[PDB]
Design a binder for this molecule. Structure first.
Ligand SMILES: O=c1[nH]cc(-c2cc(-c3cc(Cl)cc(OCc4cccc(F)c4)c3)c(=O)n(-c3cccnc3)c2)c(=O)[nH]1
Lengths: 300, 290
């Protein structure tokens, strides 16, 4: 029993976090082999409104960049820009380097965040990419260059680098290839984010997790087509559910014997009725930061 | 900005996890220097687990210790309270600076759940006032540890799941938290209560995050009255936590607000019910970047 928003063991990322300085500007970098990855606005100053990143990089030498892995000063022997990520060639290969990959993730995916300051981790926590491509993280100034990731066996899938906090208090960033998620740019101009919606297929996976752990108070005797569920779920700002979603919910239907569409009916009623004083897996709201894969890993 | 339930980095602790096998019983152990700590109920058979006599049940060779794909040679075994100690040939080189502490209820900590010696994930808990923790554990997770980092301060080692889905365990000296024993029998938690000082500290984390306050200051005596009705631990003068109101300016006003929230009853920092698993030291710790 039990159900908590658990992150992966951060150990394999902790061994990669270094500190990157360029003039007056200090933030975190990720050290994999002989390359350190960090946000490119490390070269900016307060260049915030309309930075010309190529112009600013041209005026840098290798030794403009202080790389610092704990007590050691790494030596920068090369650098280039790939989209919004900076890539620094150091002369020593990180021996703590894990087996890893870079992966772009679609909204709804979950990942762990290791929030660092100065190359020092401060905490870990679990996060979902919102449909509007943002993340409701816990980030202070100094946070940039922190990373999101999944562990799969002993291979680390890196999927997020943190670049900025938006005026609303939510956070934006890039894959490790330097391409932003969502329609954002690393510059201090007005850039609004699309409306946020509940991640429907995660709420459904959560309902199954509640049933796996012994609770069925929310079910009912109704079912629904997939279209009538979407017509209702949208009015609560719920993402559409697709046939794809319904398929990956397959294995959870099997373990419970409750058919996905039947469980959509349950969700339908919960949006209509509320909790009525009750809780589900400890919460009094419907919870959308767990994917079907997370539910399968933690519950069984 | 933002507030999440955050766990300490776990790498220092991942390096100390190992598997311990006795009979068909497998579970997790804690490898520090040349000692491996785990639960004494790893010597029991299921038939033994009904009414165990540990002293009598307790040779070396019958202890398979597995660090990764390395076998630790067991050269000595002994018991301290409800914990088993296994001396091994070789000290763990990844031994961090550490120490065994014992935490009070209302204190929070991190759990690195494990299976067959392999860290599966980490999360932030609180020691419930009824001395249980609401963690997330399957069979095979016995021996996972709770801890804080400051130096790793191990405070918890997981032993059993109670019938209600909650979990009970010991400190690393083998003393149980709460009124429980390590044998399969009839045991259930005492009625539980909400950690009042932590709800206030969480209401503070929201306020300094842009989130319900109340102009109608109450007094300490008047509040506990409200609190006892609603199953809240009484608020002491120690719980008065100065550094959080001095950083956002009112203490009995926050009590005034909580006192009102309980009666009337939207959401705060994205929870619909009042959260009591953040300590005031957590709140500063998170909103400070240490
Ligand atoms: O030496 C350092 N220097 C800079 C930072 C830094 C920089 C940013 C940042 C970066 C860019 Cl490219 C643009 C930016 O405008 C955001 C904005 C503001 C107003 C309207 C708007 F549309 C967008 C901020 C930033 O967000 N953060 C930050 C703060 C809190 C939480 N996480 C990230 C930190 C740092 O840590 N170290």
């Amino acid at each position: 029993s039990g159900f908590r928003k658990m992150a992966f063991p951060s150990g394999k990322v902790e061994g990669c976090m270094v500190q990157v300085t360029c003039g007056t500007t200090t933030l975190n970098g990720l050290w994999l082999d002989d390359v350190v990855y960090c946000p490119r606005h490390v070269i900016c100053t307060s260049d915030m409104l309309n930075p010309n990143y190529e112009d600013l990089l041209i005026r840098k030498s290798n030794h403009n960049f202080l790389v610092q892995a704990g007590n050691v000063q790494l030596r920068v022997i090369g650098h280039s820009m790939q989209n919004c990520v900076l890539k620094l060639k150091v002369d020593t290969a990180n021996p703590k380097t894990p087996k890893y990959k870079f992966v772009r993730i679609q909204p709804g995916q979950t990942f762990s965040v290791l929030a660092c300051y100065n190359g020092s981790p401060s905490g870990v926590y679990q996060c979902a990419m919102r449909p509007n491509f943002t993340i409701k993280g816990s980030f202070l100034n100094g946070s940039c260059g922190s990373v999101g990731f999944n562990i799969d066996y002993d291979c680390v899938s890196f999927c997020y680098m943190h670049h900025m906090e938006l005026p609303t208090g939510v956070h934006a960033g890039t894959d490790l290839e330097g391409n932003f998620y969502g329609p954002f740019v690393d510059r201090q101009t007005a850039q609004a984010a699309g409306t946020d919606t509940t991640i429907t297929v995660n709420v459904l996976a959560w309902l199954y997790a509640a049933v796996i752990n012994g609770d069925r108070w929310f079910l009912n005797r109704f079912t629904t087509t997939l279209n009538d569920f979407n017509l209702v779920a949208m009015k609560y700002n719920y993402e559409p559910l697709t046939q794809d979603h319904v398929d990956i919910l397959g294995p959870l239907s099997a373990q419970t014997g409750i058919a996905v569409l039947d469980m959509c009916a349950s969700l339908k009623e919960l949006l209509q009725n509320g909790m009525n004083g009750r809780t589900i897996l400890g919460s009094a709201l419907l919870e959308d930061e767990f994917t079907p894969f997370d539910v399968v890993r933690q519950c069984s």
